[PDB]
Design a protein around this ligand. Structure first.
Ligand code: CA
Ligand code: CA
Ligand code: CA
Length: 546
């Protein structure tokens, strides 16, 4: 229940803060900015993988689960981070990556050493078919989902990058070792896990070919390994052997789960996770804004989980997506839309997550060279598509509007060199607009995006209706206005958001003994009457009704 009232902040450590001038963010960097997060009002800190890794996927390819990435620091630095986080009245949850390991993980080095060895079926191996791969499955990062090993004359499976071989969850020895590793971290006193790619662990037995109606070289293989039948057997065991033994919060990255099939994931009775990251409103790995479509999706999840006593994880950004201002708002009304977006997703029923930079209203970036980018997915995509005849401009268009690297440029702290993120050369170039968008500037401006998030966190903590209140959608047919209420006892909160770059008129959806304006991003017009709302572009208002 503490995780229900919590506000979470997601840190992408490589791009948060560098403290020793090598252009790479580190743990001591995070430690130096804990005041910032504490003063923001953050309850829970989720940190992206900080384990030993070759960084072919920036930490999500782990070669040692119990050692810290050398770039980030040592185990002592982590211990210091956890100790300092805990003394500031905050909690830390780690990223649990157990769908796959690095190909440099000792398990896999042994696994690939011979066709028969005790670690061979720790991963997924298969002989080829017709001098080619076992099947036509495409990796999520493009190319074949199978990599050939010359020594043992067989292919190993990787849903993601080549250096990320999938673990074999049908092997009980694999599960046992993972369970031991998980409990090892929980014994250290961490407060839970974000469970990475957990919906990809069950493969369709036999790994059959998928329908290829357009005769591609490789086929998008979601129907082969995402939320496949039988996955709940593993997840239920995972909970029973690890999570259920501790007072922690677990949030599973569960791509491919819909609002009607979310029961055995997040239901109060029998659910394997406290909450999940669902992607129906986001869309992973796709290559104005129908506001009503967004209404339907978010409302489905609100109504759907309320019915089974589930709990929603609320978010608009993360390290795998583009910036929300570009995706849902407007760059022509950056400051305003960022606040409008904030109030929109933050004040729904669930636990809100804040990704680094989101509270500043950071936007996408446009680098001209493919060499300026890092995402293994888009680098592969460039290479493949260019060979097929796509122009440089065509591919960069996709990368700019869609590439997740938009969310991995350094955190913008001030107006100094590299926005104060590093004294050296950042691993990824800083967004040029840092001279306008940074923490220092937004701290002293009471109308900044940063201070708006501070107000949101504060009013949510002060009003139980904003935490446990029932959600109801208002004015569904309005293509510009997203309005909804939160109701708890004699308290009704009315959240109004003008999701358009234009002025809009809107009748107040009225029966109250008291009304109060909890938050607003535009100055209040004195002549304006409550019933006739004249909303500016991306104006948002939250009324409290008694
Ligand atoms: Ca560093
Ligand atoms: Ca089995
Ligand atoms: Ca007005």
């Amino acid at each position: 229940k503490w995780w229900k009232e919590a506000v979470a902040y997601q840190i992408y450590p490589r791009s948060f803060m560098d403290s020793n001038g090598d252009g790479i963010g580190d743990i001591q960097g995070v430690i130096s900015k804990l005041d910032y997060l504490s003063d923001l009002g953050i309850d829970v800190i989720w940190i992206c993988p900080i384990y030993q890794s070759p960084n072919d996927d920036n930490g999500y390819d782990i070669s040692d689960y119990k050692d810290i990435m050398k770039d980030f620091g040592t185990m002592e630095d982590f211990d210091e981070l956890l100790d300092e986080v805990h003394h500031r009245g905050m909690k830390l949850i780690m990223d649990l990556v157990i769908n796959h390991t690095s190909d440099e993980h000792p398990w896999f080095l042994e696994s690939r050493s011979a066709k028969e060895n005790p670690y061979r079926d720790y991963y997924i191996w298969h002989e080829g078919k017709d001098g080619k791969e076992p099947n036509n499955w495409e990796s999520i990062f493009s190319g074949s989902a199978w990599e050939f090993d010359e020594k043992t004359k067989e292919y190993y499976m990787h849903v993601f990058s080549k250096k990320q071989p999938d673990l074999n969850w049908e092997n009980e020895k694999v599960r046992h070792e993972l369970y031991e590793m998980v409990n090892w971290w929980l014994d250290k006193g961490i407060d839970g896990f974000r469970v990475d790619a957990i919906s990809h662990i069950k493969k369709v037995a036999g790994f059959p070919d998928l329908p290829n109606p357009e005769k591609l070289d490789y086929v998008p293989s979601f129907e082969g390994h995402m939320n496949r039948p039988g996955i709940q057997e593993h997840l239920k065991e995972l909970k029973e052997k690890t999570f259920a033994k501790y007072d922690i919060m677990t949030v599973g990255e569960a791509n491919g789960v819909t609002s009607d099939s979310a029961d055995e994931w997040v239901a109060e009775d029998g659910g394997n996770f406290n909450m999940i990251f669902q992607f129906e409103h986001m869309g992973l790995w796709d290559k104005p804004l129908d506001l009503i479509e967004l209404k339907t999706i978010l409302t489905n999840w609100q109504n759907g989980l309320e019915k089974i006593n589930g709990w929603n994880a609320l978010y608009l950004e993360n390290h795998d997506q583009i910036r929300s201002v570009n995706k849902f708002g407007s760059t022509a009304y950056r400051v305003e839309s960022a606040k409008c977006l904030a109030a929109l997703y933050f004040l729904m029923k669930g636990t809100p997550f804040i990704y680094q930079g989101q509270e500043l209203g950071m936007t996408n970036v446009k680098f001209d060279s493919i060499d300026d980018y890092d995402d293994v997915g888009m680098i592969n995509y460039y290479r493949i598509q260019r060979e097929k005849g796509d122009s440089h401009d065509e591919i960069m268009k996709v990368i700019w509007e869609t590439g997740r690297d938009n969310s991995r440029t350094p955190m913008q702290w001030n107006t100094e060199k590299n926005a104060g993120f590093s004294t050296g050369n950042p691993w990824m170039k800083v967004n040029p607009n840092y001279v306008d968008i940074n923490v220092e500037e937004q701290k002293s401006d009471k109308n900044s995006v940063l201070n708006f998030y501070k107000q949101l966190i504060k009013i949510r903590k002060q009003h139980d209706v904003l935490v446990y209140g029932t959600y109801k959608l208002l004015a569904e047919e309005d293509s510009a206005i997203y309005a909804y209420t939160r109701t708890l006892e004699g308290k009704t909160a009315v959240v109004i958001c003008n999701m358009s770059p234009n002025n809009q008129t809107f009748e107040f959806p009225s029966s109250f003994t008291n009304i109060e304006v909890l938050i607003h991003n535009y100055p209040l017009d004195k002549n304006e009457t409550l019933e006739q709302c004249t909303l500016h572009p991306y104006e948002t208002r939250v009324y409290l009704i008694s």
